[PDB]
Amino acid sequence: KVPSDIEIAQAAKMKPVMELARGLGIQEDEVELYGKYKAKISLDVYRRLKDKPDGKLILVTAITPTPAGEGKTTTSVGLTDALARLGKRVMVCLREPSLGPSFGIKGGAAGGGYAQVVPMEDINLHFTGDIHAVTYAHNLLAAMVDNHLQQGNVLNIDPRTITWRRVIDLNDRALRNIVIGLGGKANGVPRETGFDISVASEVMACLCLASDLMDLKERFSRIVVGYTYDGKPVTAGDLEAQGSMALLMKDAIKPNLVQTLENTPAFIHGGPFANIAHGCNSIIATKTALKLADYVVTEAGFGADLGAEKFYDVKCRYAGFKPDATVIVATVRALKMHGGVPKSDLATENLEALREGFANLEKHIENIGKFGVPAVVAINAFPTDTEAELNLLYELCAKAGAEVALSEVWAKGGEGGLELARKVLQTLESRPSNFHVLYNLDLSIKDKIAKIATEIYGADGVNYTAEADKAIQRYESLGYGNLPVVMAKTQYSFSDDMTKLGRPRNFTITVREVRLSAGAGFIVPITGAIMTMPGLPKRPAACNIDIDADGVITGLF
């Protein structure tokens, strides 16, 4: 049988999200429809269920990404289906994807196979407009910065230091580096700047970490946009922009309820970068699903070393959350690559390479342990996976000493994860959690990076360029020394060197630069150029995308 993910999405029998909401005891007037199959949930649903028991919190993370793929989100939705099959009160919370990729390398299912959140096509495009709202809040601050300079530069901004760029949610490399403000005294003040993809915006990071709209407003007011000629930070707060930015985000601050193909209730809300930001869906979604369900399944971008760590160290930290379980997803095709197998050679089994690659997963496993969180492993199964392999790895997890199940959610739906699901419940009943942040907000910036590189990535140590030192010194000195640290580095290695697969030892990490998100409330060490505006390829999906007299869309997926 030849099934494609879009066909599965279309054939799905979606339920009115209205009744979905009714059954979680969301009231009528706390729902805000967009069509039959999407809605926004009011912040009142948490403000009322304020003191209700929080359900259980299950983080889904994964091993180190590879060109092979690991299906973190697929198994994350599959596990959600399973729990509801086994009759529990369960929502999955996921990230909203950027619109841009649909016109570049194609859009995809939220999840995969038979473990999707739907309706897929809306999720991939405008959805309920939250990224437009982010784009506008971000770009109005920029317009206002620029208007300030033109109106006499009362705050004495040095235009050449402005760090606030603009955004748009298309992949447009011609906007990476531009000069604006040309054409004369009527037309603004010439300066050098650029655009990043909207999901990279600090506004998107604020959205995702705010508790409520007034909290969002205050974060905005703290954003540093640039410096006076004398070196003094100037903030969005100084430009009186935070009110208008909060008005623009009035609706985007509400989570979007949609659903699984088996009508299990999903929240999709927020979608930051996982390198220069924490890679999680909003705090507002997760804590709402907490009050509303017994079991909240959620995820973080990239491998356990970045997403998981950031989930724990910044998201839970701010939310007061204390996660109960964490699933680490892994595939045999991936761990083989970590064993040194070229991608064109995954057709054969290699039990020797799978023994080699495992060291990756094992490091991730240990890493979860360091947080006080009961691990559990999940193998994403696949056609070419052999039982010799699956057993090997299965026993290697046992030999490693953490819970493990196999998952066939891709091709089997929420049945393919019932085993995994019982594991997690196994784990939730018997193994509490002793969850604590990996470090304290009182250590110096270097101590914090130190602690992350040392325990998590397992570097021998950290070096700093000269301007990394100058920036750190300057931040300590400006008051921003007590913040969490968000490590921007390659996701493809524990180390900062993307060729280093498996579990590299002996290496050290190098901080080349350091940035500040004052509004998000974190410090951003960077270890390599980070790509914040990806470009379109030689033959973009856009060129084959079509929509006909009937509304039939081709080329999109």
Added chain:
Amino acid sequence: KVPSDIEIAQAAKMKPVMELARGLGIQEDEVELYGKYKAKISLDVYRRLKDKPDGKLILVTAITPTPAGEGKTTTSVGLTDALARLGKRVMVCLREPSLGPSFGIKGGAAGGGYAQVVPMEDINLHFTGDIHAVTYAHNLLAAMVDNHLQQGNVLNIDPRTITWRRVIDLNDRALRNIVIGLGGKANGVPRETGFDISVASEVMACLCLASDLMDLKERFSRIVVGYTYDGKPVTAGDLEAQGSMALLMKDAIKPNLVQTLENTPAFIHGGPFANIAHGCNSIIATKTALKLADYVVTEAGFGADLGAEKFYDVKCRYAGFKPDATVIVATVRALKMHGGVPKSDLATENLEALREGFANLEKHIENIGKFGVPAVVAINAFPTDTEAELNLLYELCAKAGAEVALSEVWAKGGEGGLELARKVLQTLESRPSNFHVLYNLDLSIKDKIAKIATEIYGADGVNYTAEADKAIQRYESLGYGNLPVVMAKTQYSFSDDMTKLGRPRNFTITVREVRLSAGAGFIVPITGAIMTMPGLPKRPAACNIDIDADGVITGLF
């Protein structure tokens, strides 16, 4: 006595729009809700009612705009309400406002006082997302032009001839003139360009003039983006972008149902410029309205010399409409300015300056008669007008052969529009229109500009600069010389000089530049500097805007 606009609109008791829809004979599955009080309606309505007769079509326009204000949209909504009170089955169709002005000069009612369409807050902000859709269709085409240059430039476009700019829906003067594609070979091709405000987008003009989604796609394929090194035009179609643009507009193509404060149904859809475009809401909303209702009230931007002329000569020409009557809104104060009274002295009675400024209203009344449409004058009441002023103005209207009514819809809602509405009904009953457009498309471009300039503006003739001559000569030989012409000129005068108020004589107009909108399907001759991207003022409304814990918004209106 009368509340403010913002308080008026919050105290409004709105009906669920689904109720209004089923009231109109629209089926449930033709309706897509966005909350209880907005919906998008399917183009299937029009299609299944394609054979039904059209209702009566009433255009609302105004005298030449002045700093005194004329109150045109208030008159549209108030007339609509008065018609519903007289028992008529009536809809109003209106433009969506741009998001930008909310943050600069301040947003405002769609209407004013007791004549508004609601929900006001959403209408002014993201509404149902149409403008975000226009922004992204437009900016994706620009991204694809730039990617084409980057990927080897197979079409051999000369980057310096590219006319397709970018858009954003905020007032940002610093984006008027920019240089993009900097950073070296991996970052695009250096070129000079800029942003316009999104509602100025040709994509917005295409939305407003499309008959449906596939016609919109076709229009997209015809947009000229630049020329090759040999001077041949290059289109969106040559770049294969139209399918994607169409996909991005798949919901924006649907008109939006909302309502007046008295619950009369209202469509809001599209919102182009009135100088470089035709200044009307979409053909799609108007034509659907005409099937659903027996009377449809719509309006056009700027005074009757610009919006009414383009309503008749572009929008009616494309759609096959034949307007039945036209209401011209005037005020005592605006006419006194046209007769030489400075703004600071408009309260003082001045029958002689009113008699002189009336020549402005007299010329508009004559102009509407040249399209074969009977005209009724609506006088928006103002507290300081004297009886003798009103009485003189009525006698001058009757001497000019127009019916006239005092309108007090601002203060009294639909009840204040009853005399206006009955004069319109008496006109519809006893003077059927003999509608015809002003000019045949087969005239040369110059003969079309002269017809409009001499007959509508009262100009002696038209001069052209050398650049305007060459442009005209190129477009004629490229095959675009049979299109409608859309004059972009100041709205403050019949002439191209904004300080010639009243009915100026012995003047000539000077066309300085001619541009092409090949997708929207017209030629745009330009007289003075046209501001396609307005700037923020010294103190933007954005600095005063707040929203509190309650969701209470101050500073916005």
Added chain:
Amino acid sequence: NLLAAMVDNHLQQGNVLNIDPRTITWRRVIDLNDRALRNIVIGLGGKANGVPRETGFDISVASEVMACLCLASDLMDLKERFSRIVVGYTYDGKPVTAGDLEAQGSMALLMKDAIKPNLVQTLENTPAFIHGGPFANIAH
């Protein structure tokens, strides 16, 4: 600066050598200390005014032409050296030289007196030559 003018004219006149303007390494010079000329963008104004590209000025004594003067054996060797200067690369990554642009004869003509060393003297009248004056970091 004549070589730079000829590179830019080549782009303007149809770019027959197919230089990628963004790979061009030949900058301009002036012999004043002007930091504002370090990073610039030229060729703006539309199709009649050149090809937009990013470039800058160095101080004249940093010029490779200055290094060539100092290392030439005579005028014809200087002309030859000129013909070998790499100014940028084509879209395929092949180098493009002053020789491919046929500029070396003109450059040589402009240096026809500069190729001659200058006799002056010390305060005690001992004879002295003064001639050429390159950087000591990016040149010798």
